[PDB]
Enzyme design. Structure first.
Site: not given
Ligand SMILES: [Fe+3]
Ligand SMILES: [Fe+3]
Ligand SMILES: [O-]
Ligand SMILES: [Fe+3]
Ligand SMILES: [Fe+3]
Ligand SMILES: [O-]
Lengths: 388, 510, 166, 388, 510
Positions: B97, B127, B130, B192, B226, B229
């Site tokens: 992360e 991030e 996270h 990811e 997510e 991302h």
């Molecule tokens: Fe992440």
């Molecule tokens: Fe991510």
């Molecule tokens: O993430």
């Protein structure tokens, strides 16, 4: 089904019984404090420090690192994922920095969310209250739309100047502060457009398009040097620290503060405009917040580094001088805007007093910190030489 | 005078116009591609709305953690094995992360279109969130759990062991070192989309099955971010699809990215799940095939076909080397248990039956080994036996792939057993596969990571542990243990008495 | 006496402490990088400590350079006295003139070994990293898998000590 | 200890198995919607409505009540706990009201909390940014300290006027709205003091004591009739609807809006005061929020009641005439404050125009809803007589 | 130019000065007392800070409810008996919270000192929060529980039964009808200090014991606000202590308030706890003595001695009548089960032992009664039997106290067996104790509440239930049930078939 097909170990009798049976009688270590090995900046270790310090996997060869060995995968050519080579500044420990406001992600978005929601409420009240009725039409259709709008490209440029720093910062505490400094900048840029969009909704012929304010920024005269200074701080600086220092301890602290505080926040109220100041209150609250972090990093940590104090100050005094010049030019070009104001808005006496407030505040909060000998009279004099 | 306001989309409509032209307006990072400056983003967000949507999630999450979950003693009523596994899962994911922040910062710098920059920016902030969330998990288990050691200092204790090196390759350096696009592939298109997205949810599954309701609370919240991302990764390809350089380079960077990521996760994730738990959710062989072959290799990659993207050429190889991979690695992880920052357990009777049932042939190889080690006293401090001794005795050298950092043992492995050793300018190198070998041969200066045997060579085990703080509060008991029971914990002295001195296995070819 | 603190490291800190001339310090750094960094290092004797040692050298070179140069030079002049921009522009020219990846790699590696800060200013250095790296990758990633490993091993010039494949 | 001594049925294997075995195969009723019998104001029933409507245990003899029979304990003499006798207004159902903002307790304190924390940030930014330097000394020490300060007592009085209603309101939805209308008024009064306390910290010699503002309120001339009106609305009105209606749809809508928006919000900026407007922004946001609720209750529900529309409008017109006179007197006396301003601050034309904005807004948002025939020029002319 | 702000205490410092003098500045409510103009408050709060401290609590509470507790299916995994008990507990408390809003609005009006008004104000806001919190509990169990009926419409279905009438006396009318001070005593000095504050915590224990983690989450949060209310009550006494009227009237209003509150809670709380749960926490007899006699009637009350406050003269009778009170009442609640909005169950074998063990003699009386009712088929829909019939056949009339509304059967009760029947101006009145009798005799016009028998006289049972919507969504099955099992649920037709017609028991008197 009502119970579901999935059995959970915390509530399922059979599974929970097995888990409980395997548990020890007491914790296998009484030290229940994550980050206990981190040196507290304050009385006791804070959640901010525990959750942040040492998240970055630096090895000992990068001042402060606790790991060892080279990176597992580097750039074609050999450049390290992170390295001492990405900045002129040196220190005994890159993890020393501390955001005075101790902002990790949660508090950070909590505060900005509150501002977003109250902003929405404010706008709904302002419009329902018909307060736009007492706002000067020229100041709105000309100075807020064109000149305040044009300034969004300045804040936007300063935002983008943080991109490389987001990639190169040598520590977690410094990376988080930088990210927030930049995110707040783009927020401001978006708040400028938000107002223009708001005006568009409550003022029949107001056009929210960025066409006008953009042209002013890209071709105008008032912000010419301003844009040049931004294009340089952003795309010509490859040192993440020079970028952050120069932007926050030089350019934005002088030019930015003058435009936001000594021009719009100061003059808008005179044209019956409480709308724009509502947003400047945010920009200034953000500026003063970031300032504490900027000061803690470059002064408390680097400028006062037990081993590189002298060196670092030299480098920053150098940078201070390198960008002070483009900043002065920016302030001069901006001075021209005063000539566009309606007769009787302000006098040279007032503007001179406003310039010294910026310069004196700058010397007090930044210049004196690294022993940069700056002359308040020559600076004000050089900028002041840009009027009619 | 109707109540009026302005929303995120109304401002975002003009975000693309925010960037302007000028000579030096270009990425500061080396790259073979050109991201189109007209590229758009899927989610029309501005800084303030982003903060609000995340703040609301934080509210639920921390509320559950600080209140009900704590009142339920959720931090304690978790299986011992899982408490240990989360030290690795949460902290290793944490660095992923964290480096992802820098990675998207690099992608933010790469993008020229304002909207694409804004897309990456949202991830930069995500991030960061996270990072603090994974940190919070360890922080919470440390504060309220059955064994805070490791949860409380993984950031420095993770440094002692070999598993950490490989984690840094796929979750740290792979994310930020190289062509920005290559990094994007390691992080978003592969990392990811193929692994983390599915993994994070799977972890909440194994967590719940083992009594852990803390991790599901945090990880399920991470999962909600997510989709942005995934989109970032998808748009990365769309942004360079028109550039001629794409047809010439994309499929190779992707393949190198795919191999890089799977090389570590195939063995490591299956190991953490099956060997770091008591209650099982699903056999890793089944999971892996679904994630990599079906969902990613098929559906996901399939959608990028119109952009010239093709299934990694090394996919067949990956599947061939996967079957026994996690099983082969746990043998090494346990044999080297004193180098960890977590406590490990040998499979119990029910588990051995489960392993044999799902992996025919498991018992005859791994099972018999574990019973041999246990009967010899590998769990008892007074035995003077660490499984690493068994490897030395039976001449089973353990190597570290110079590229992936993944430990491998050719003479014992039920899986891949290939081994390539080269010498170049006074330095020996050991590779475990043909893809990693190509990487090193073509890019020698990108892979000079010293392995644990090189750094610890000639050092006595207890000294390394002591120096790197692999001890618990009492300053004598090891953080790592060969069992998860509360009694008979190994101490630094128990290790020192073994007189284990590290040797660089590659020197045997001299 | 091992990982983070050891005799060989203590020895080098006392060695750099004897430096008191930008010219001397700057020369030792350049030489240190030639002997202990990159796959082309003169030897791997300091493999476990060179990364840390190098940094400690850089510190001495940086401090001296700041006290020896004037503001203008500290920004545009190398520790050796060369004109940063000149070197940067020159190296890039050669790189763009490289006939192949083998030639390109040599140019990039060498550049790093010779001008890595505190030698060349970071701004010019990273700017070079940007242009040089791009070209190196362009040449290396073209038909990346065409050359069979047997052949690639020969091109790299590696000495194969053992190969095993079931 | 580790697990503690208290066993919980959700997690204790033995107890949970006992619980699980007694559970039905599926819910004993599929109607899982609390408040399903409540007639929704909007498309679907809201959480606001579900958690609020019918909480009040009214019997059917109080319009809309679902219970039956007399109260269990009444006042000495026989007065009912709640009854039709506490207000002149009548309706088919006292539960019809809906706060357009759907505020139950959680959303209400959430928003005010956001406003509180941001207020704190703002003040810290404002103080740190030194924006106080450009505020006119006279405006600060005379008009903000004494006259804006005295206005806190006006808002405090309006707050207190809500006490009886909190006790007598005939339904939950109306009680909740009324409570919030009142709570926002005390908040405003406290924000006026908050500003005075803030100025006392950043301005040497500034006295935060309420002595001066209070003496102005209790014995001055500018607020004499305003105070007389507030004392009346608060303590001479025993009808909870006459109180809420007259306070919000007459007095505060005219006098309140004029003072807050047309005097302070309008003139503060002209003296370089962005501080007071920050707080007035909240007051106006609150005013506009309450207005929606006041309009829904008095116009949508009562003034447009299918059976008592004509009756309720007659009563509200009566109350409007009753309280319009005291309100005009309040505005008339307030006109005296303009003579205290530094010459050139404003003029008769500006004053008149601002009066008309308030009167016209009032006619549109309130008077017209009940067919009250207000004569805008007659009202303004009566007020202008107070100009000195 | 240093960062500075202003906090709540700094503004509160001047709040006392906010109020000013004028001829008509006086309370609008009748009262024998005079609250001191200078009374102060304990907590120095202002609106903004009040909102923030409550907002923080809400975040944790709702986060737990919406996230973890929902993921754990906490709304379902609760004992059937307790799911039913919370229908009554949460909705009945809800009305207390609600009337407390009006009550404190009345006290805010009574207070003349700005600080005392402000203290009461905070409670006005708190009681609004508590109303919505209790609402949420029923809202949550209806949405996610095993039986939503009753939880989803208690606001209208509770009007069918007799237990609701008594609840309104102590938690609705007792809070707002009378001298503001009398109301304050019922609400704060007695109600909250003696019963609610302790009750709320006790409820979370019984809840957790029976698998309910929803109620604990909400009620524990409600509990954090009670300190302020306790203080309001204490300050009420202080504010009026130096007024001559106090010595004359205080102890009388206090004694009346105490009897009022106790009369209902003594039997009802013990009933909900012991009979509405599977797993027991503590015998009501010991809980009561500690709450009423020790904690309140001793510690708390004694602290107010300095202000003239004396222990309620009726305390002794309360204790004597207490012992069997709740047992005597459950017999009535169960016999009248068709009039409720919740399902009830006969004590099971394991429970009867607990009752006998904790209440010697319970079995010879209540035990045998229940056994006979079950033998008569009180749980079976085809039996055509309802306990009420048993009361009729064995000539045991059930009366309703004209004052407290508490139902009583003097001819069967093991506890108080007193009965006073008066005729006055053409109306009959029935009393169960000497304290309530005095109240009616002295204040006839305050107590005219018609009882269920008077209102339902001559009405067939199924018609009343149908008219007051006592049915499930299928429009046939009763909400109320004589057992908590999932099958063999009684329908409107089952009751109609009984042909049970109410009659007013007092009419038998000539
Ligand atoms: Fe992440
Ligand atoms: Fe991510
Ligand atoms: O993430
Ligand atoms: Fe309450
Ligand atoms: Fe209370
Ligand atoms: O309460």
């Amino acid at each position: 089904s009502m119970l579901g097909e999935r059995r959970r170990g915390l509530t399922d009798p059979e599974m929970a019984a097995v888990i409980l049976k395997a548990l020890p009688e007491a914790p296998l270590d009484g030290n229940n404090k994550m980050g206990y090995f981190v040196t507290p900046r304050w009385k006791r270790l804070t959640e901010y420090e525990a959750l942040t310090v040492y998240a970055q996997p630096n090895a000992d060869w990068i001042a402060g690192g606790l790991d060892w060995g080279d990176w597992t995968q580097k750039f074609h050519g050999g450049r390290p994922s992170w390295g001492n080579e990405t900045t002129e500044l040196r220190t005994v420990d890159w993890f020393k920095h501390r955001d005075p406001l101790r902002r990790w992600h949660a508090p950070y978005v909590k505060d900005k969310a509150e501002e977003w929601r109250y902003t929405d409420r404010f706008l709904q009240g302002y419009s329902a209250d018909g307060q736009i009725r007492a706002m000067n039409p020229t100041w709105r259709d000309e100075f807020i739309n064109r000149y305040w709008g044009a300034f969004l490209f300045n804040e936007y440029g300063l935002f983008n100047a943080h991109s490389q720093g987001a990639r190169e910062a040598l520590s977690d505490v410094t990376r988080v502060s930088l990210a927030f400094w930049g995110f707040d900048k783009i927020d401001i840029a978006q708040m400028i457009q938000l107002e223009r969009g708001f005006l568009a909704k409550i003022v029949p012929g107001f056009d929210e398009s960025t066409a006008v304010p953009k042209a002013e920024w890209t071709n105008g005269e008032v912000y010419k040097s301003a844009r040049l200074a931004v294009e340089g701080l952003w795309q010509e600086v490859f040192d993440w620290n020079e970028s952050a220092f120069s932007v926050h301890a030089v350019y934005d602290a002088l030019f930015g503060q003058f435009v936001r505080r000594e021009f719009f926040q100061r003059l808008a109220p005179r044209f019956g405009d409480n709308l724009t100041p509502f947003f400047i209150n945010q920009a200034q609250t953000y500026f003063q917040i970031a300032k504490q972090g900027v000061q803690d990093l470059y002064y408390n940590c680097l400028g006062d580094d037990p081993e590189f104090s002298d060196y670092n100050r030299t480098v920053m005094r150098n940078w201070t001088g390198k960008w002070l010049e483009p900043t002065i030019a920016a302030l001069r070009d901006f001075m021209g805007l005063f000539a566009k104001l309606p007769a009787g808005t302000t006098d040279k006496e007032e503007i001179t007093a406003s310039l010294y407030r910026v310069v004196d505040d700058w010397i007090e909060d930044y210049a004196s910190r690294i022993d940069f000998k700056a002359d308040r009279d020559q600076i004000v004099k050089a900028v002041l030489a840009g009027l009619k | 005078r109707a109540p009026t306001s302005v929303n995120a989309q109304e401002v975002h409509r003009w975000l693309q116009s925010f960037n302007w032209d000028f000579k030096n307006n270009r990425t500061k990072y080396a790259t073979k591609y050109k991201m189109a400056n007209e590229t758009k983003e899927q989610f029309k967000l501005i800084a303030k709305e982003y903060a609000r949507m995340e703040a609301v999630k934080d509210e639920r999450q921390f509320g559950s953690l600080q209140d009900a979950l704590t009142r339920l003693n959720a931090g304690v009523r978790v299986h011992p094995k899982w408490n240990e596994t989360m030290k690795v899962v949460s902290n290793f994911l944490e660095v992923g992360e964290y480096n992802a922040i820098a990675a998207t910062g690099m992608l933010w710098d790469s993008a020229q279109a304002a909207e694409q920059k804004n897309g990456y920016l949202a991830q930069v902030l995500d991030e960061i969130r996270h990072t603090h969330q994974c940190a919070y998990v360890n922080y919470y288990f440390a504060k309220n759990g059955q064994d805070p050691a490791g949860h409380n200092d993984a950031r420095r204790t993770r440094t002692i062991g070999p598993l950490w090196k490989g984690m840094k390759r796929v979750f740290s350096d792979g994310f930020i070192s190289g062509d920005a696009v290559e990094c994007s592939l390691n992080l978003q298109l592969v990392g990811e989309a193929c692994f983390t997205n599915p993994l994070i949810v799977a972890v909440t599954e194994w967590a719940a099955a083992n009594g852990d309701e803390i991790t599901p609370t945090v990880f399920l919240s991470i999962e909600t971010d997510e989709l942005r991302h995934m989109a970032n990764g998808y748009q990365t390809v769309v942004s360079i699809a028109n550039d001629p350089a794409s047809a010439k380079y994309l499929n190779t960077d992707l393949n190198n990215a795919f191999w890089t990521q799977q090389k570590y996760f195939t063995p490591v994730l299956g190991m953490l799940f099956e060997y770091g738990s008591k209650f099982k959710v699903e056999p890793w062989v089944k999971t892996w095939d679904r994630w990599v072959y079906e969902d990613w290799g098929g559906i996901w990659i399939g959608r990028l076909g119109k952009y010239g993207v093709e299934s990694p050429r090394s996919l067949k190889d990956a599947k061939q080397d996967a079957y026994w991979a996690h099983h082969d690695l746990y043998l090494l992880a346990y044999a080297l248990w004193p180098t960890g920052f977590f406590r490990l357990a040998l499979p119990d009777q029910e588990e051995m039956e489960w392993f044999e049932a799902n992996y025919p042939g498991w018992y005859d190889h791994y099972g018999k080994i574990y019973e041999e080690w246990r009967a010899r006293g590998c769990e008892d401090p007074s035995s003077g036996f660490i499984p690493l001794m068994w490897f030395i005795e039976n001449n089973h050298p353990i190597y570290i792939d110079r590229v992936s950092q993944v430990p491998f043992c050719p003479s014992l492995a039920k899986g891949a057993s290939t081994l390539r050793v080269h010498e170049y300018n006074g330095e020996m190198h050991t590779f475990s596969d043909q893809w990693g070998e190509r990487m090193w041969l073509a890019e020698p200066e990108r892979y000079e990571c010293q392995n644990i045997f090189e750094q610890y060579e000639g050092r006595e085990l207890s000294e390394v542990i002591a120096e790197l703080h692999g001890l618990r509060s009492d300053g004598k008991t090891l953080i790592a243990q060969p069992h998860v029971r509360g009694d008979k914990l190994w101490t630094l002295d128990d290790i020192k008495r073994l007189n284990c001195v590290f040797k660089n296995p590659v020197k045997a070819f001299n | 006496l091992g990982i983070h603190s050891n005799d060989t490291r203590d020895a080098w800190v006392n060695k750099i402490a004897q430096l008191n001339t930008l010219e001397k310090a700057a020369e030792m750094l350049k030489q240190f990088r030639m002997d202990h960094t990159t796959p082309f290092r003169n030897s791997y004797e300091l493999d476990n400590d060179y990364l840390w040692i190098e940094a400690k050298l850089e510190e001495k070179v940086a401090v001296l350079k700041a006290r020896a140069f004037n503001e203008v030079d500290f920004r545009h002049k190398t520790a050796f006295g060369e004109d940063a921009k000149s070197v940067l522009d020159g190296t890039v020219a050669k790189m763009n003139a490289a006939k192949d990846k083998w030639e390109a790699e040599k140019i990039h590696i060498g550049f790093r070994q010779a001008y890595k800060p505190p030698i060349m200013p970071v701004n010019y250095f990273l700017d070079g990293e940007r242009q040089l790296g791009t070209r190196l990758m362009e040449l290396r990633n073209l038909n990346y898998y065409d050359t069979p490993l047997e052949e690639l091993r020969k091109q790299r010039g590696v000495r194969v000590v053992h190969l095993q494949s079931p």
